[PDB]
Tab-separated table of C-alpha atoms and ligand atoms in Angstrom:
chain	number	residue	atom	x	y	z
A	1	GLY	CA	94.659	84.210	101.723
A	2	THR	CA	91.604	86.559	101.461
A	3	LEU	CA	90.998	90.353	101.183
A	4	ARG	CA	87.640	91.627	102.615
A	5	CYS	CA	87.342	95.264	101.443
A	6	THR	CA	84.968	98.245	102.056
A	7	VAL	CA	85.133	101.584	100.142
A	8	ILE	CA	84.610	105.038	101.743
A	9	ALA	CA	83.477	107.695	99.190
A	10	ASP	CA	83.274	111.301	100.536
A	11	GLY	CA	82.835	109.721	104.008
A	12	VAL	CA	80.059	107.259	102.905
A	13	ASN	CA	80.741	103.526	103.660
A	14	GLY	CA	79.855	100.906	101.022
A	15	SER	CA	78.249	97.646	102.275
A	16	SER	CA	77.447	94.219	100.726
A	17	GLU	CA	73.737	95.367	100.788
A	18	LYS	CA	74.206	98.993	99.505
A	19	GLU	CA	76.748	100.856	97.290
A	20	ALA	CA	78.246	104.040	98.843
A	21	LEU	CA	75.901	106.840	97.572
A	22	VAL	CA	77.816	110.162	97.162
A	23	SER	CA	75.474	113.207	97.332
A	24	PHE	CA	75.408	115.535	94.294
A	25	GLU	CA	76.558	118.435	96.575
A	26	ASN	CA	79.549	116.350	97.819
A	27	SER	CA	80.465	115.458	94.163
A	28	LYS	CA	81.081	119.192	93.326
A	29	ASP	CA	84.640	119.271	94.854
A	30	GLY	CA	85.400	115.732	93.556
A	31	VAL	CA	85.066	112.472	95.563
A	32	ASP	CA	87.625	111.397	98.211
A	33	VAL	CA	87.906	107.585	97.693
A	34	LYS	CA	89.563	105.481	100.451
A	35	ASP	CA	89.540	101.658	100.548
A	36	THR	CA	89.747	99.600	103.769
A	37	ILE	CA	91.323	96.114	103.405
A	38	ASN	CA	90.827	93.334	106.011
A	39	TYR	CA	93.290	90.495	105.181
A	40	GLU	CA	93.608	86.911	106.549
A	41	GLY	CA	95.837	83.884	105.692
A	42	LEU	CA	98.896	86.021	104.776
A	43	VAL	CA	102.414	85.285	106.181
A	44	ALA	CA	103.040	87.154	109.506
A	45	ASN	CA	105.559	90.089	109.305
A	46	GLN	CA	106.005	89.634	105.484
A	47	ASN	CA	105.907	92.720	103.203
A	48	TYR	CA	103.258	92.926	100.406
A	49	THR	CA	102.698	95.279	97.440
A	50	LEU	CA	98.976	96.280	97.610
A	51	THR	CA	97.656	97.650	94.265
A	52	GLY	CA	94.177	99.237	94.248
A	53	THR	CA	92.381	100.172	91.004
A	54	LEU	CA	89.298	102.441	90.750
A	55	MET	CA	87.162	101.253	87.788
A	56	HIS	CA	84.304	103.129	86.046
A	57	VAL	CA	81.363	100.667	85.590
A	58	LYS	CA	80.001	101.729	82.134
A	59	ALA	CA	76.228	101.460	81.304
A	60	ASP	CA	77.142	98.499	78.957
A	61	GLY	CA	78.659	96.714	82.046
A	62	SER	CA	82.356	96.898	80.913
A	63	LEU	CA	85.099	98.574	83.048
A	64	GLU	CA	87.462	101.548	82.410
A	65	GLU	CA	90.418	102.389	84.721
A	66	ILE	CA	90.085	105.816	86.474
A	67	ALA	CA	93.010	105.542	88.950
A	68	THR	CA	95.582	103.025	90.295
A	69	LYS	CA	97.597	103.330	93.556
A	70	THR	CA	100.305	101.051	95.033
A	71	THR	CA	101.481	100.847	98.679
A	72	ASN	CA	104.153	98.833	100.558
A	73	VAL	CA	102.388	97.191	103.555
A	74	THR	CA	103.259	94.505	106.152
A	75	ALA	CA	101.127	91.530	107.334
A	76	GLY	CA	100.508	91.729	111.130
A	77	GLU	CA	100.456	89.040	113.887
A	78	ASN	CA	99.227	85.630	112.520
A	79	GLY	CA	98.991	87.119	108.956
A	80	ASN	CA	95.679	88.962	109.655
A	81	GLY	CA	94.930	92.693	110.095
A	82	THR	CA	93.821	95.864	108.278
A	83	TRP	CA	95.427	97.995	105.525
A	84	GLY	CA	94.268	101.228	103.849
A	85	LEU	CA	94.587	102.549	100.295
A	86	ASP	CA	93.805	106.234	99.640
A	87	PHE	CA	92.861	107.176	96.023
A	88	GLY	CA	92.664	110.832	97.216
A	89	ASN	CA	90.299	113.271	95.455
A	90	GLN	CA	88.847	111.787	92.204
A	91	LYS	CA	86.901	113.900	89.637
A	92	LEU	CA	84.048	111.363	89.277
A	93	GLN	CA	80.962	111.902	87.065
A	94	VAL	CA	77.424	112.613	88.380
A	95	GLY	CA	75.155	109.561	87.766
A	96	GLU	CA	78.076	107.097	87.328
A	97	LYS	CA	79.090	103.955	89.267
A	98	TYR	CA	82.686	103.022	90.265
A	99	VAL	CA	84.166	99.892	91.906
A	100	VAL	CA	87.521	99.379	93.725
A	101	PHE	CA	89.663	96.287	92.962
A	102	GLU	CA	92.571	95.198	95.236
A	103	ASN	CA	95.575	92.905	94.569
A	104	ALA	CA	98.161	91.964	97.268
A	105	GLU	CA	101.465	90.340	96.134
A	106	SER	CA	104.255	89.313	98.594
A	107	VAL	CA	107.664	91.031	98.040
A	108	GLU	CA	109.420	87.693	98.879
A	109	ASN	CA	108.895	84.181	97.434
A	110	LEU	CA	106.633	82.525	100.087
A	111	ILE	CA	105.338	79.432	98.149
A	112	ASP	CA	107.167	76.287	96.889
A	113	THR	CA	105.591	75.228	93.515
A	114	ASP	CA	108.142	72.483	92.487
A	115	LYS	CA	108.401	70.281	95.678
A	116	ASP	CA	112.100	71.219	96.440
A	117	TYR	CA	111.384	73.092	99.788
A	118	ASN	CA	112.872	76.222	98.100
A	119	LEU	CA	110.232	79.030	98.128
A	120	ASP	CA	110.068	80.215	94.474
A	121	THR	CA	106.677	82.043	93.990
A	122	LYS	CA	105.054	85.177	95.534
A	123	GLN	CA	101.742	84.803	97.449
A	124	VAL	CA	99.017	86.676	95.435
A	125	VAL	CA	95.554	87.515	96.911
A	126	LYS	CA	92.988	89.447	94.798
A	127	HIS	CA	89.513	90.973	95.282
A	128	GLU	CA	88.511	91.995	91.699
A	129	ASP	CA	84.678	91.778	91.957
A	130	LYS	CA	82.671	94.411	89.975
A	131	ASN	CA	79.457	92.970	91.604
A	132	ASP	CA	80.654	93.601	95.253
A	133	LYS	CA	78.536	96.564	96.533
A	134	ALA	CA	80.899	96.993	99.579
A	135	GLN	CA	83.585	98.140	97.030
A	136	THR	CA	81.105	100.180	94.893
A	137	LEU	CA	80.180	103.905	94.950
A	138	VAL	CA	77.533	105.815	92.926
A	139	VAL	CA	77.558	109.630	92.427
A	140	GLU	CA	73.899	110.716	92.948
A	141	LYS	CA	72.117	113.036	90.475
A	142	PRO	CA	70.679	116.309	91.842
B	201	LIG	CA1	83.500	115.729	97.605
B	202	LIG	MG1	110.639	75.458	94.991
């Protein structure tokens, strides 16, 4: 299983090549942060708990949690498709960088870990990459 994720910050797409740059003017009423999640290799029609976390990337490189959202979502045909996670309006700081992490965990046991053909473990897929610019936004200075 894989999650391939792109952030939208006040309407600005992140990409692997360029963080989502939020204009100073757009930062004044906060920053609307939405994540888009393309998943593959999940179990078709199974329910997952998707947890997204918005992390402040501090000048020293460490991370601080700003917001966390959970949503009940369902894997589509052949266990691939698209989900969304809306952080809503976040009061982010001018000049600062933020990154979105995602974690998908099946509601049901979908994996046999003890060779008894009884499914006993949830499927877990994570994208927790502070160096992924597609999941990163920066609030521009004036
Ligand atoms: Ca705004
Ligand atoms: Mg088992």
